[PDB]
């Protein structure tokens, strides 16, 4: 359901990293599986070859924190018009403070050590619940069934 | 028939793309995604040699009439010609702008024909390597390209869902008869066998232009699976299948007459020995092996 269609119709795209994170572009293949592509440093952008009807999302390539693209979770190339490439503007989201506080602690603390923090067991599990695309892909499949 | 497993060849470290018997019945060539061609004894399944060159994985192999030469077709955009005695690349055939998927010597074996993701059919000279004619064949990737009995025609198949016959001499499209995953000419000359990705094989009289047989019951929706005529003993259609089996149909009555079990991945290539009742069969990444099956008819 959440997967690239094999249209074989080429599309020129500009992956524009407008975040301070090193970004990992992630192509959803024809069976819905996530393929890592080469990383974009912050404040860079790149003309790249994709296809119509394909699916992308983008992540911190170092921690797998999720990022927005053109204000949303998924990016889908269409046909170029009048010789114009299509822009995928990789943006940070407004993380919740909690989510951000987890990002920061995660990056300061080796996971073999989360439990030597003096905090409720609740937060240990929030810490350990590292972000991954598959969890998000699942969550996003389901909101589209409400929508 | 009663084809039973006899040998299993487990040399490639990556998926196996194509298996072809030599016309002299002596050898089996295998191409693999691991960039290698490997030669096997047809009867005793013995490792003969590895052939290396291609900078990416290989998709198809084809023998010359005299069993002395191979054409390979590769992701690295190249078709290369090999002396089979040496292991030595005689030529590289640049011309396609994307992955090359299929290849075949003409009966005379002085031409090679090839198909590519670039949506084109190319014809080559074996002596020089000069591409002679580039046919604007399809508007989508070419899956198979074969020469007829006297080498005067070419059949091609493509993901545009069309199958087409070319006059070799000029390059004009003589006739045009879901994606077409595979196509080839019947030994007896008159017929053409074509797979579509609606889980279907079909036999056609190319001249008259109507479908005479339909072979079903196997799984074929994603992969371009190589199909065959076996006619050494009885007359069968053989095919790989995505459900990991080798299927065999009574060619005339369309009945499934056997399913060979052993493979642990999609069987993407079958080959029927030229003078004897032997089948070669090859599977993908979870398998990585070639199996040989020998029957009484």
């Amino acid at each position: 359901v959440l997967r690239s269609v094999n249209s074989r119709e080429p599309s020129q795209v500009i992956f524009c990293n407008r975040s301070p994170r090193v970004v990992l572009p992630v192509w959803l293949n024809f069976d819905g599986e996530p393929q890592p592509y080469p990383t974009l440093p912050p404040g860079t952008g790149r003309r790249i070859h994709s296809y119509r009807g394909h699916l992308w999302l983008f992540r911190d390539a170092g921690t797998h924190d999720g990022l927005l693209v053109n204000q949303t979770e998924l990016f889908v190339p269409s046909l170029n018009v009048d010789g114009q490439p299509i822009f995928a503007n990789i943006t940070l989201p407004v993380y919740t403070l909690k989510e951000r506080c987890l990002q920061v602690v995660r990056s300061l603390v080796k996971p073999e050590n989360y439990r030597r923090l003096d905090i409720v067991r609740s937060l240990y599990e929030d810490l350990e619940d590292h972000p991954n695309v598959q969890k998000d892909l699942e969550r996003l499949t389901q909101e589209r069934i409400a929508h | 028939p009663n084809y039973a497993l006899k040998f299993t060849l487990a040399g490639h470290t990556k998926a196996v793309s194509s298996v072809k018997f030599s016309p002299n019945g002596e050898w089996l060539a295998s191409s693999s995604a691991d960039k290698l061609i490997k030669i096997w004894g047809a009867y005793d399944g013995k490792f003969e040699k590895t052939i290396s060159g291609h900078k990416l994985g290989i998709s198809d192999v084809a023998w010359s009439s005299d069993s002395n030469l191979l054409v390979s077709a590769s992701d690295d955009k190249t078709l290369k010609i090999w002396d089979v005695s040496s292991g030595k690349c005689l030529k590289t055939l640049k011309g396609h702008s994307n992955y090359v998927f299929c290849c075949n010597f003409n009966p005379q074996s002085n031409l090679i024909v090839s198909g590519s993701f670039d949506e084109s059919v190319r014809i080559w000279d074996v002596k020089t390597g000069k591409c002679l004619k580039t046919l604007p064949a399809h508007s989508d990737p070419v899956s198979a390209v074969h020469f007829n009995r006297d080498g005067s025609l070419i059949v091609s198949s493509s993901y545009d869902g069309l199958c087409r016959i070319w006059d070799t001499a000029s390059g004009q499209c003589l006739k045009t008869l879901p994606p077409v995953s595979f196509v080839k000419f019947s030994p007896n000359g008159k017929y053409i066998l074509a797979a579509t990705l609606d889980n279907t094989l079909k036999l056609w009289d190319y001249s008259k232009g109507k479908c005479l047989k339909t072979y079903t019951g196997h799984k074929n929706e994603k992969y371009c699976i190589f199909a065959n005529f076996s006619v050494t003993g009885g007359k069968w259609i053989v095919s790989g299948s995505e459900d990991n089996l080798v299927y065999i149909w009574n060619l005339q009555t369309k009945e499934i007459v056997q399913k060979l079990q052993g493979h642990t991945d999609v069987v993407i290539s079958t080959a029927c020995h030229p003078t004897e009742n032997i089948i070669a069969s090859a599977a993908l990444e979870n398998d990585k092996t070639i199996k040989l099956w020998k029957s009484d008819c």
């Binding site: 300061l108 603390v109 030597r116 923090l117 | -």
Partner: protein
């Protein structure tokens, strides 16, 4: 270009926004909305420097680059009450604990 401020007197801290193009005066009238003391009873500062009512926030060094939502610039506030003038006094926040061993 908007600016983002903490206005700080003693142990009170106001979060509010303005334009670089606003005057210190018009920010004294914002503080009047909140703390209900007129602009003649307020003196606003940056560090030590008494800010004049006719200069814009921008001119006083308060830019989109130095007064951000996630890192607001501090504006000191001291009141007058008739003939009595209080000197700017800002009580500092609590320190955090010494960072734990596993966060080094």
């Amino acid at each position: 270009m908007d600016v983002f401020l903490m206005i700080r007197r003693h142990k009170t801290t106001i979060f509010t926004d303005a334009k670089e193009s606003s005057t210190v005066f018009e920010l004294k009238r914002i503080v009047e909305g909140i703390l209900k003391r007129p602009p003649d009873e307020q003196r606003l500062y940056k560090d030590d420097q008494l800010l004049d009512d006719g200069k814009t926030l921008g001119e006083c060094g308060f830019t989109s680059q130095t007064a951000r939502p996630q890192a607001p610039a501090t504006v000191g506030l001291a009141f007058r009450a008739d003939d009595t003038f209080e000197a700017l006094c800002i009580e500092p926040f609590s320190s955090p604990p010494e960072l734990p061993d596993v966060m080094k």
